RNA sequence: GUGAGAUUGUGAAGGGAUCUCGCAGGCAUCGUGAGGGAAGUAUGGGGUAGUACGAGAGGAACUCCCAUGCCGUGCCUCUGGUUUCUGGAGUUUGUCGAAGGGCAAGUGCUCCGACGCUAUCGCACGGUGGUUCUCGGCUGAACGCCUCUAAGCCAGAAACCAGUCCCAAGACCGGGUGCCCGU
RNA sequence: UCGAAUCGCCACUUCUCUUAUCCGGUGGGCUGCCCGCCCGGCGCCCAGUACCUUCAUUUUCACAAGAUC
RNA sequence: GUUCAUAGCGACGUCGCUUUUUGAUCCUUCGAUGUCGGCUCUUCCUAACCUAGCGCCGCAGAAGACGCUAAGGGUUGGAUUGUUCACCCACUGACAGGGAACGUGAGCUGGGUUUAGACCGUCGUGAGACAGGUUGGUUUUACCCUACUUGGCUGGAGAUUGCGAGUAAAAGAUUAUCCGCGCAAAGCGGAGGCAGUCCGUUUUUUUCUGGGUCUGCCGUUGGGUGGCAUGUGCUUGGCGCU
RNA sequence: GUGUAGCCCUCCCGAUGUAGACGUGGCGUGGGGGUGAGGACGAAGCCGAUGGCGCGAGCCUCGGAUGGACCCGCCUCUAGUGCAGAUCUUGGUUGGCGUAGCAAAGAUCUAACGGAAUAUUUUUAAAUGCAACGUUGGAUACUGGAGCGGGGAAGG
RNA sequence: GGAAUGAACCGCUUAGGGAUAUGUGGCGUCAAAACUUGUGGGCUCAUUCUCGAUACGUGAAAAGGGUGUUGGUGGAUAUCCACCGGCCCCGA
RNA sequence: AUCGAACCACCUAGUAGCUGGUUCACGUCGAAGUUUCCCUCAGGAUAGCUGGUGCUUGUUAAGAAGUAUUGUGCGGU
RNA sequence: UAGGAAGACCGAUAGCGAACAAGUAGCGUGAGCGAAAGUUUGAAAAGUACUUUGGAAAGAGAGUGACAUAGAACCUGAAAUCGUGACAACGACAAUGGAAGUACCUUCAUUUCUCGGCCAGACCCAACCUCGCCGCGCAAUUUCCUUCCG
């Protein structure tokens, strides 16, 4: 017999298996084509999740009832250190697949980038990459990376080079890790001679994300989503919680199959992992690309509001703390919780439409306390708010 | 495959460098499929190693839309309760000879496993094949001996794309690599063949008189 | 050959014979992608335009633009919900001699309440190419007329395949790299 | 440490294409006949066709009691 | 059907298909296969209601009829009734039809049906009967195997053994006996000398040390620069040094 | 000389079978009448990679690093005379399985003492003797007079 | 022992074993046999539940159509008309 | 803890055309589900099919035959 | 109630319910119902003095005895089930099963050892079964062959 009535089924079957993700780091499974007419570019960037907060702008856009307006978007803040680059692989295309042709190193490496080799680094005779520095500038040292480059140009059709973060620069107090995140990004544009010399190039230097992105362009968000453990149907699938007289419990599927097949089939919900997936999410919008604080003390300051204030709340990010480092504004949310490693990555799909060729202008960023109902944007503001306290008063009078 | 550090010291202390177990290089172009797989099962069974080339060029009786339908009917089938386990549909073509041959076995005894386990197909001719030594055909399976002139006829590769295959513009690009490298290599030489073939001529009247006779009574000279 | 064991049914010392096992990899990282899954779908408005057609009455459509329904993947800046931070305050009966400070009433009860979790009750996002069917044509015979069909060629559905996306070497990767050990 | 089964090999084979196709290519004369032109190998008992030269009792088959790896 | 068999229909006849109705039978089950409907949830079919693409009309436009390819996606909220079915009120692009043991009770519910109590009508002399109406009437067990959902540990190429040797690797005294450019070319470039021991059937034999002068390097010293995002690494210029 | 280890040697013809019938100098068990043996230099019973014989039911030898007092061959007579299942009877053992659980009545903490129940290490102190018991003092709390109060009947 | 599978179909009917030859059924692989036999003829092309291929086995098909192609019969004229078969296609 | 007639012992091992069970080997043979009668239709008696024991005989046929030939009758598909 | 005589009987789940402190223990308000259980260690208690560890139970030694694996519910001591040492290997076809070989094990049996009942090869006689090569009969080879014409 057919059902009574007609609905649609719950949860999409691309998504299977709903299980723990093999790794904690965001990772680009797939680059953006190569067009060889282009100059030579990186292609990706890693950085790290710092809060949320919300901004107001004027919207241009002809023919709708919100144009020449104001709006109030949330966006989300991440932390961008420069990146450091230590190694170029090639890659030939075999009929069976990818396969590496080799590395050839920098020569010359940080700490925090060898702790990422070892589970105990303190109590270790920290040996790694010892005897390659030892071997790779001399005369058949010069020889083999000479070679090694030879069949880069002979045989290679794609070039990436491996790049790590640095975690002293990022220096975070809820952030426990010490050793590097590494990762392979993408040089695309150009013929093979021409992206080899930008790899050389940057060798040992530091890269930064201005050098990646623009500022009102858009970008894919790699992540792993915020964990949830053993979870039941209702929750992991959506389905609809059974009548208040139902004996033995109410969050529960009726039936799990018909009397034929005899079986319980896979497009079936049933409870288990909820969450800590991952997830690519593409078409973010970015508006702004800011500076550490250091060097540009005005980071959240507008030309339409001359108040001079940084980018971090009052009283701090909720479990993060200060961002003391260049960082990216992007438009709406980001999976993960606070503290991850995201990889940005340029956009897959086209980028021809009106709503992401549009120019943004920011008129105002807003910097009150996340804790409770934040209603100051600065200090000053509390401070004239609130004349002299007590604890002011007898600080003046121990002073005289 | 893989030699463990067991057996690099073993043949480290007996002395041994190199071993080529005797293997059969078949050069698959312009074969019908189910009459070259069915004579090669035969073979395995009788204990012969063999490697296949140029899987792609392989040929089947009637229409590319024809046979493109077969496929599409064999994709169709899978386990509803779990396709994980269901019947597994490879794309390549050289993945296609094999399980066609793997159908003309005993595949679920140990004596058909192995029988399976001693044949190779590649796609074109790799780097590790070109050098072995001279290829053999089948005449039995020919397709000009077998299909009339006038009837239409698929090439494997072209079936195998538009159906998953990925990898034709690759295969294309190192097989015509390939020709230029061998045809090169070939056009060098020509002087000892040429050379060799000059010592064979002039040999003769220098040959006792007698000896030159018997290789004319025989047709050799 | 060499290094370890065992020969355990009717004392305890010695030697012999034989049988089993080991004689080479280990840890740590960056990737490949066969195969399997697979997802976006629909309505309205602006303009076209009171235009085309029509005696009149009445009355279209494509490019392009702006929104919304259902579904899907996430998020907590704002708004709402939730309080065993029993946080701060208030208040009833009993109780410690009173005030202070408390305690009991399986969280006494009332108000406000952070962090966290959460709602289409709040926010963000949801792509690209090919092979073809029905059908429509071009050249063209059979059949010195013709014919989209016999050979050949072109265009081409919410269909099908691949890309993007999720899992991924019992798919046994002779893919790369760092250090230790043996040779 | 291991006694093992397997018993052609080559820097002349180890390039390509056709079968309604000059099957080594290739022109001419009058719709098939006729006439011209040019260019796998070794290996099997003297390193080579020739004079010379040790084969045993392992004294009638037995895995070649010998080789390759 | 304005005339016009076939736009659309189509009588009198005749040929089929389906198993979603009801009959016919009695093959399996009576030391038991839980018997209606609804709720929840997944999947399949096409004989196509909407959405896509075409042809044709008794297709001026608009609105429709019919036919073909098409099952990718979708197909609602309520009043009375235990209902399936039906009928009304509204929304909508549309409110199509079926199968899965008449899908689904160790998933629920228990209104219906179908025990024991009791009332009515008709029937019976009576005990009692009625597929007539009415009211009240226990819903038991998973900790086993498999399936499914997540979660971990660990072998394995003669798929645990053989010593049973096949690279989507290079290209040569049979990979030995050096490096760079070049097409598996033509050709063109670079290389430190001395003495000893132990080994040595050859061609400047094979090694092990000591000075022997060192290009290229590792680890330094300060001092002057200089770059990077700025407590940590480098590059230039001299000290001796391995 | 029906039938045995068939008195012996040639030759010819048949050979399966449920329910059922019949045959066998066919096998095995407890006891009686006869006959002939065996045993403390080891009877019965028990065990087995102990083999040999027979189509088979079975028989016999061997070893016990088993046992410690009875027992068998043959001819006959006799019967409470042969087991895989009866939701069979009585004992024993068993996976499930170190599993399901041991969740009403609110609840204990601290020091000293007692105790074999510790402060147990030979290969600085924590990372190598845990956990738990009674009494007394102190703290905290419950019953809340229709009481886990103080006395009786029935029953014990 | 054969028809892949089946109480009943085909062959054959049965003491324990060798050699030889057959029956039914077969000789591309699975799988023994034409290592894909003939120095024998014809016919057939079948696009989405996918041409056809071992009887019993309705263990699936009809009426009605098609110059798709290959054969016959009977009439006019030096190609035309009517009718009937084979294989394939629609009806499905 | 027992009620459309309590409990205890006995008649009582009540009767059952119905359900379940029924313990060694080899050898020679080997069926029936049909007829008539029965308060007979899930059962019997009776004949047929089978086994055992034979009797009387014979060595080409005695009273042989699921078959032909010749002669001579019958029949209404 | 006292004696006697026996048995082709049963032999501890049998024979009386009772081979034993049995109409007992136990069950039921009651009438009534009603078991299990051989103390069979050894000829004889000679029933383990004493040393050492342990709170004790016990363990490790010593001793009695022909035997202590005869140690006290103690003759013999089976099967089901379990522990330990050694070994054999083995993917996933659930295992078990049949046939025919092979690789390792055999506290088994029989034969031989200067002739052998061992293992191979060739040869001879008889019998049976095949292949090559060479032929015959028939008016089967005249519904035919060959010439010259119309
Ligand atoms: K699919
Ligand atoms: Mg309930
Ligand atoms: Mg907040
Ligand atoms: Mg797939
Ligand atoms: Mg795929
Ligand atoms: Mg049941
Ligand atoms: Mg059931
Ligand atoms: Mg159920
Ligand atoms: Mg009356
Ligand atoms: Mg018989
Ligand atoms: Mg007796
Ligand atoms: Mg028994
Ligand atoms: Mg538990
Ligand atoms: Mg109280
Ligand atoms: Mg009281
Ligand atoms: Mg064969
Ligand atoms: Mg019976
Ligand atoms: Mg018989
Ligand atoms: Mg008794
Ligand atoms: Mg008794
Ligand atoms: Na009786
Ligand atoms: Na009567
Ligand atoms: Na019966």
Redesign the pocket.
Known sequence: ???????????????????????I?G????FPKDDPSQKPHLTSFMVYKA????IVRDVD??????NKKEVV??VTILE???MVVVGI?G?RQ??????????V?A??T??EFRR????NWKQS?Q????????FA???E???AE??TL?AFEKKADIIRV?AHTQL??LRNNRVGVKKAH???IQINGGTIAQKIELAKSLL???V?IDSVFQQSEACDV?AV??G?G?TGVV?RW???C??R????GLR?????????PS???????????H?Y?????????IYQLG??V??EPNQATTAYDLTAKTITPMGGF??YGTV???YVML????????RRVITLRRP???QT???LTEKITLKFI?TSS?????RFQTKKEKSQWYGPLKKDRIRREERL | ??????????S??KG????????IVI?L??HVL??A???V??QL?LGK???VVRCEKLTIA?????N???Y????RK?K???????P?????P??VFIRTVR????R???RG??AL????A??????????????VVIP???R?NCYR?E??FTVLGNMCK???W?YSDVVEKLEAAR?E??????K??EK??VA??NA?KEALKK??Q??VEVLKKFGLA
Request: with cysteine; hydrophobic share 30%.
């Open positions: 017999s057919h059902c009574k009535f007609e609905h649609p089924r719950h949860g999409h079957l691309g998504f299977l298996p709903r299980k723990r993700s093999r790794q780091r990772r680009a499974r797939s809060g949320m907060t919300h856009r002809p023919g709708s009832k919100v978007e949330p961008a250190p420069p692989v890659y075999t009929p069976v697949g990818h396969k590496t042709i080799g590395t190193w020569h010359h940080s700490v990422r080799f070892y589970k005779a040996l790694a990459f010892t005897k390659r520095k030892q500038r001399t005369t040292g010069r020889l000479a070679r030879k491996v002293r620069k590494v990762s392979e040992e230097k530091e930064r790699c989503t915020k949830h053993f929750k959506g389905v609809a059974l009548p007289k139902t004996h033995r529960k599927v009726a039936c799990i199959g018909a009397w034929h079986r319980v089939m896979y497009t079936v919900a049933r409870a288990g992992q969450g997936h991952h997830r690519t999410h593409l078409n973010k919008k500076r550490a250091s060097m909720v479990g003391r480092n260049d438009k709406g949310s980001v999976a993960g919780p606070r897959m799909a086209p439409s009106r709503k807003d996340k804790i409770g109902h934040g | 495959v893989l030699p463990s550090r067991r057996s690099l010291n073993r480290s202390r041994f460098k190199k071993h080529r177990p005797d293997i050069d172009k312009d189910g009459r797989a069915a004579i099962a035969k069974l190693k063999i490697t009637g229409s590319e839309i024809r493109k339908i077969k599409l009917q064999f994709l899978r509803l309760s779990n396709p994980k386990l269901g597994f549909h490879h794309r390549s050289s993945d159908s003309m076995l005993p679920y005894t140990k496993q192995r386990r001693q044949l190779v590649y796609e074109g001719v790799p780097v590790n094949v070109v050098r072995t030594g001279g290829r039995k399976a020919q000009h002139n009837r239409r538009h159906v998953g990925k020709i490298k061998s045809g090169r290599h070939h060098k030489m000892v063949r060799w073939k064979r040959m006792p007698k000896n």
